[PDB]
Enzyme design. Structure first.
Site: not given
Ligand SMILES: CCCOc1cc(C)c(F)c(C(=O)NNS(=O)(=O)c2ccccc2)c1
Ligand code: NA
Ligand SMILES: [Zn+2]
Length: 268
Positions: A54, A140-141, A151, A174, A228, A252
């Site tokens: 590759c 999507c994540i 992080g 989403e 409110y 932190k």
């Protein structure tokens, strides 16, 4: 029998969920994945031969962010179909609610990598609809397990909103979000809004951050910082209350920052 274990790069990773790799791939005890082109393979020996062959050392598409050894690649689902299909099959192993894996043309994919001398090593990604009617800035994540809670997910969340800023729009991920996805978004929302309140209406916070008003409101409610009055949510916080929350424990860890100066991206 399903894929239950993958080898990618130098990691072995157990699956969390069914992902619809072809039947003869699932029957294998372990799936081997090229970390660069995301080709999946049945045997260590075909994996070892591919690695020697590759030529990819980074994702396809264009590098739209680079600061030091953190890098983001934008990849159009129509221009790199196979790659994005393999990415989706990989992501489905760790996402319960993802349903789309082969119709990748309506999506753009943003691949987070961490670079060293050998190449750009995939950490995670988020997909995004080229045209989102519901105003979703993330479809999507996913962060690969060995990189979770370090992080990288916060970086990608912040990154999705920087795109929304450049598009002069607000957006929301989403739903439904995964369990770790909910906590990550709520923590990022709190960090960002609390920092802006330390340094403003709800509409102002929305325009400055590209967070939707609903997500701002629901976050301020969880922080008990909204009043409110006659059908309207109103921000009610004292500068000392903000500082109390901000110096608390969970804010932190030093983030990987999205440096907008290093983001090379023009809105479609
Ligand atoms: C593979 C299934 C889920 O994959 C994910 C998805 C997301 C959106 C994530 F954020 C993470 C993740 O790793 N979060 N922890 S975090 O990055 O350190 C962080 C710290 C503070 C505020 C926000 C995030 C993992
Ligand atoms: Na694992
Ligand atoms: Zn490859």
């Amino acid at each position: 029998k399903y894929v239950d274990k993958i080898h990618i790069g130098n990691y072995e990773i157990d699956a969390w969920y069914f992902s619809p790799f072809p039947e003869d791939y699932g029957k294998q005890p372990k799936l081997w994945l090229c970390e660069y082109c995301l080709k999946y393979m049945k045997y260590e020996k075909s994996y070892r031969f591919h690695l020697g062959q590759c030529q990819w050392r980074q994702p396809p598409g264009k590098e739209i962010y680079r600061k030091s050894n953190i890098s983001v690649h934008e990849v159009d689902g129509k221009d790199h179909k196979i790659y994005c299909q393999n990415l989706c099959l990989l992501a489905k192993l760790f996402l319960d609610h993802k349903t789309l894996y082969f119709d990748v043309e309506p999506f753009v994919f943003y691949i987070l990598t961490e670079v060293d001398r050998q190449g750009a090593h995939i950490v995670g990604y988020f997909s995004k609809e080229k045209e989102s009617p519901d105003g979703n800035n993330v479809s999507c994540i996913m962060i690969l397990p060995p990189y979770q809670r370090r992080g990288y997910g916060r970086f990608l969340i912040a990154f999705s909103y920087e795109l929304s800023k450049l598009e002069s729009t607000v957006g929301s991920p989403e739903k439904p979000l995964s369990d770790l996805g909910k906590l990550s978004y709520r923590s990022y929302w709190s960090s960002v809004l609390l920092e802006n309140l330390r340094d403003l209406s709800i509409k102002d916070l929305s325009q400055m951050t590209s967070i939707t008003q609903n997500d701002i409101i629901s976050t301020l409610q969880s922080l008990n910082m909204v009043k409110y009055w006659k059908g309207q949510h109103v921000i009610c916080v004292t500068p000392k209350l903000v500082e109390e929350h901000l110096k608390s424990a969970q804010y932190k860890k030093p983030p990987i920052t999205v440096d907008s100066v290093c983001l090379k991206w023009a809105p479609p």
